[PDB]
Write a protein that binds this ligand. Structure first.
Ligand SMILES: *[C@@H]1O[C@H](CO)[C@@H](O)[C@H](O)[C@H]1NC(C)=O
Ligand SMILES: *[C@@H]1O[C@H](CO)[C@@H](O)[C@H](O)[C@H]1NC(C)=O
Ligand SMILES: *[C@@H]1O[C@H](CO)[C@@H](O)[C@H](O)[C@H]1NC(C)=O
Ligand SMILES: *[C@@H]1O[C@H](CO)[C@@H](O)[C@H](O)[C@@H]1O
Ligand SMILES: *[C@@H]1O[C@H](CO)[C@@H](O)[C@H](O)[C@@H]1O
Ligand SMILES: *[C@@H]1O[C@H](CO)[C@@H](O)[C@H](O)[C@@H]1O
Lengths: 460, 460, 460
């Protein structure tokens, strides 16, 4: 068992991209390292400076009949001096001596806590970088209020969020399964022959053979299961799809794409800003217990016994003898296996109450209803995204910018190449029911419940 | 078992839509991914910028004999300086030095809490984005009061809400079913033959065969069920159908539709603003317990026994022998299955009392009547929509705007295409009673009560 | 089992209605969706803008010798400066410098709480939108007092209410039925033959056959029922039929009817303002318990037994044998079903006492007489309509307006078409006693007490 990492050879140098003065080249990954071998360490993509031999046109947008700002975002004239940071670099609340004319008037209006990070541009592994391509500070001069249940406030709705409810949806699943199987097998045998021959001046011949045999098999098995899962949802959100504003640090990174399907830059872009964006989330976070017991007793026995009681004797003078032989054997074999797994997981909430709750779960005693309530009041402060409906990031690249369809054509294939080349289906699978897991480019396998070996080979 | 996602090829590029300068093209989805395969990730619809080769007419409404505003909504002259935000951008309470003449006079008149979000533009999955196409701030210079039971106030009726009652309709269902079936089968057999032959100088021949057999089968079964469901309704609402005002961020998105049935834009519109709007809701929210027990004991036995007691002996001299043989067998097999499911769900109410109530339900002890009362007083703050009578969103697109019937003809087919192409009837169904569920474009199946496999195959 | 929704094809485009500049067309619904199929979603009626090719006359009323107002209601000269909002837009208390001359003088006179919403324009489903076609602010310069029992005040009688009493009519029904049936059947059989034949040097032949049989059947059944129903009535009302004033937002919607029996607009009108108006109601609200128990025990047994005891033996030398055989069988089968349903419902009253009362009902303990009294004092605040005598809405369209009889001829057939096309008698009925219920255009069936299937097929 010895597998090492591998690399494909590099490709050819494509072209000096004239709008970036760099030629790119790339390669792929054949086989990731496995079974205590060398790690691949993500060495795809390469860059090299070159002089532009044939210069491109000046790639800048027209920004027709709109006030250009000091960032690159083009806003309208209606957003002038509105008291809202619309250009990004505060190009409204400085210029004029006119009225600030706030569209949210003297009504009690605050800033939100859930809508401001409403992108959660997610990656296909499952973890979510908050590198939001959206900009949740652009209000576009509107004042739409969305109520809160507990605090009785009036939060705002940013322009990129199309809907934002605050329900209170608590939901506890609970299961406990139980299996048991006893079996007691049993087999006894007793045999006996007693032969006696007598002549008549005589001759005798006796034999008393007494065989016995005995076998038991008293084996039980047991297999429990338990599963608590209590979700707590506080609302949701749904993002938009047309006339969407993007943040400042993202339009530039789309504008710096090599436009010719150069493979090196897109694998950096898709891990800087994620693969998909959560177009419809649901905040508030869960907890979970799992209690997998397992038991396997076994007995087996054997009780064996033999006897021969011979004799002889005759009067003619006298002669006699008496012979005895007796053997006994016994075997007891009592085996036992026992396994207990406990897993607990808990997401969301303040640091002080959630880790009271986790240990009150794992103690096994009953939890008085003051810690789940305190954690559920805590979850308003620190929400954790729990369920999302994805959407690809090339459904977000704007069309106003130059070479938009070519960059979308690049990003629609880069996601296929990213999901293919880092897939788990390149490492050869582990035997004995071992589930292979790609991690750090090093396919580690998890063995079920009995196998301590890396290849799930050694048993107990 | 290995299914991956599939895609149809793209269509042809239709036409530069001259009023939007973009040509659209699209495709469909053949088979969603299933059984631990690649996800489809919603890649329908495509956009591309193009120069308008043949320009359209200037698509703007006439707004005949009405005061146009700084949003696009056309109000009447009666709404001038009324002290109500009718244009959306406050084009009443700024202009004149005349009287504000409030139609709600010095009577105690407030703003509502249930009517202001009275659209709940819903989607066919079951969840409800609050992206209200209606505008519940337009009062049209009228003062219609609707009373409250508990607080004794006088809320208003916005123009888009046609009726709004506040009942107090509490309604608890409760069920508990119970099934049980014991059975005890039993079968015993005893056999015996005793033969004895004697001559007469003699010869004997004996045999004592003693067979026995014994079988039990003592199996019981049990299957409980419980179901609490206590709804609490606080009123309802019924929206209108003619002379309806729409919000500012929705008439623009209808005006930006490609008018030629271009499939890419309508699938973004129908998931920005939902598929249907709740034309008749009922607020106030439920809770629910479900307690599905299951039990299956089983015993079976077997007790077997054999015996042969032969003999022989004669005087002529003497000879005799006595032979004994005896076998015994026993099997006990005692199996047991047990399953407990508990589900609890709770909607509506403040964060502090509802999650006291849920754990007081799941404890199993009796709940003193102070937590259901406190949750029911809490439900006035945070209502949750509970029952609705839908209506399609192409019964809402106004007819005053240009190309209204063509856009309604597009939206009446886009709902059929949306309900067909994301239907569950494309994924091949799971066996063993597994109910397939479309989720994230990845058809996951739920297996009933015994099957841990993805295809519901492995049993216990 | 697979039924989907269906639609008839659309009709022909009728005519540009010249007073509304819109041609209408429509269709019908053949079969609603049923058994987990596609929903119809109410797609009847259609509108389309068209230029008026032949213009109609200016549809406005004469309003002969009456002061026209700024709404469209024509009041008399006697109502000038009376201090009552008669035109709707306050065209009395602004103009003159004369006396306000209130017809209710310095006597203690208030505004009502039950008469102000005295329409309750109801729909044929059973639920009641408060979209009152009547106007319960028009007093017509009269001062008619109607007393109150508890508060000792003097409420007013609006012109649309012809009579208004405040009784106090409490009425509790109570039932408890009980059925029980035990039966114990029993059948035992014992048989025996003992034959013995002896010769005489001999020969014997014996036989002792001993059969037995035993059967029980000890099954009981029980079926309880309980039904509390305590109504509490506080008064009633009776509306008028001639010289009736209607509200401002209803004469316009009658005036916007297409006049040619165009089917699309009337199905929106009849669900904006209901099908009938409650011409004679009775306020104050009920509560209700239902306790349906069900039990079905069953036993059955069987105890079977057989025996053959043969023998033979003769002296001639000697020979004999003895043969025994004995079988035993036993079956016990003990089945049990149990069902408990509880339903509770409660209408009317403040939020704090009614939901104390509901849980004091469902606890099963006796309720001390302090919660029913507090709920009955609460019911003065929040009444709920409980019994009504309907009347069709085309007995309410005024005759002064133009094309009144044609619109009444349209509305007298639109109610027949509405009650026919959304009737439950289009969905094919469910078997096994399943009652079909039309809901959301999706005929769901309810199965009685044992059947969990959608088509009431699977039993227990
Ligand atoms: C994958 O690994 C897990 C780890 O415990 C194991 O339980 C499971 O049986 C493996 N196989 C599959 C198909 O999930
Ligand atoms: C669908 O899945 C559920 C999940 O438990 C199962 O109970 C049910 O039998 C399945 N089939 C149908 C027809 O609902
Ligand atoms: C209708 O459905 C109900 C639901 O329980 C059932 O009790 C009744 O027998 C059905 N049939 C009729 C004729 O009411
Ligand atoms: C990467 O590219 C270099 C270019 O010189 C090769 O030499 C190397 O073997 C690898 O393919
Ligand atoms: C989408 O459309 C492109 C257009 O070039 C095709 O090449 C592709 O195969 C897919 O159909
Ligand atoms: C509705 O009416 C249209 C009119 O073109 C038909 O094409 C359609 O089939 C339905 O009947």
């Amino acid at each position: 068992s010895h597998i090492d990492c591998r690399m494909s050879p590099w490709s050819e140098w494509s072209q000096c991209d004239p709008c970036l003065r760099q030629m790119f080249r790339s390669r792929s990954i054949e086989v990731f390292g496995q079974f205590n071998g060398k790690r691949c360490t993500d060495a795809v993509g390469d860059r090299r400076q070159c002089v532009p031999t044939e210069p491109c046109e000046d790639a800048e947008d027209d920004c027709g009949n709109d006030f250009q700002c000091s960032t690159g975002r083009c806003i309208k004239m209606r957003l002038r001096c509105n008291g809202d940071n619309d250009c990004g670099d505060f190009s409204d609340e400085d210029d004029c001596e006119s009225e600030p004319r706030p569209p949210c008037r003297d009504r009690v209006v605050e800033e939100s806590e859930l809508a401001r990070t409403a992108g959660y541009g997610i990656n296909i592994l499952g973890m979510d970088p908050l590198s939001t391509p959206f900009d949740n500070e652009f209000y576009n001069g509107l004042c739409n209020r969305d109520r809160d249940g507990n605090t009785l406030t009036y939060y705002r709705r940013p322009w990129n969020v199309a809907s934002l409810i605050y329900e209170t949806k608590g939901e506890k699943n609970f299961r406990t399964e139980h299996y048991e199987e006893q079996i007691e097998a049993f087999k006894s045998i007793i045999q006996e022959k007693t032969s006696n021959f007598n002549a008549a001046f005589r001759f005798s011949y006796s034999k008393n053979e007494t065989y016995q045999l005995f076998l038991s098999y008293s084996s039980k098995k047991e297999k429990m299961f338990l599963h608590v899962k209590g979700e707590i949802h506080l609302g949701r959100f749904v993002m938009r799809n047309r006339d969407v504003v993007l943040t400042t640090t993202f339009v530039d990174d789309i504008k710096a794409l090599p436009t010719t399907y150069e493979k090196g830059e897109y694998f950096a872009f898709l891990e800087t800003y994620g693969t998909h964006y959560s177009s419809s989330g649901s905040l508030g976070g869960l907890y979970e217990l799992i209690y997998v017991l397992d038991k396997a007793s076994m007995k087996r026995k054997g009780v064996e016994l033999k006897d021969i009681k011979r004799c002889l004797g005759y009067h003619l003078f006298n002669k006699d003898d008496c012979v005895k032989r007796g053997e006994g054997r016994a075997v007891n074999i009592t085996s036992e296996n026992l396994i207990d797994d406990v897993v607990s997981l808990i997401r969301g909430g303040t640091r002080k109450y959630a880790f009271e709750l986790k240990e009150k779960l794992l103690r096994g005693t009953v939890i008085d209803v003051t810690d789940f309530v305190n954690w559920a009041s805590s979850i308003n402060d620190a929400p954790v995204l729990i369920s999302q409906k994805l959407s690809p990031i090339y459904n977000l690249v704007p069309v106003k910018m130059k070479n938009a369809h070519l960059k979308k054509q690049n990003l629609e294939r880069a996601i296929e190449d990213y999901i293919n080349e880092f897939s788990v289906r390149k490492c050869h699978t582990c035997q004995n029911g071992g589930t292979v897991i790609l991690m750090d480019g090093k396919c580690l396998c998890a063995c079920p419940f009995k196998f301590e070996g890396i290849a799930c080979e050694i048993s107990k």
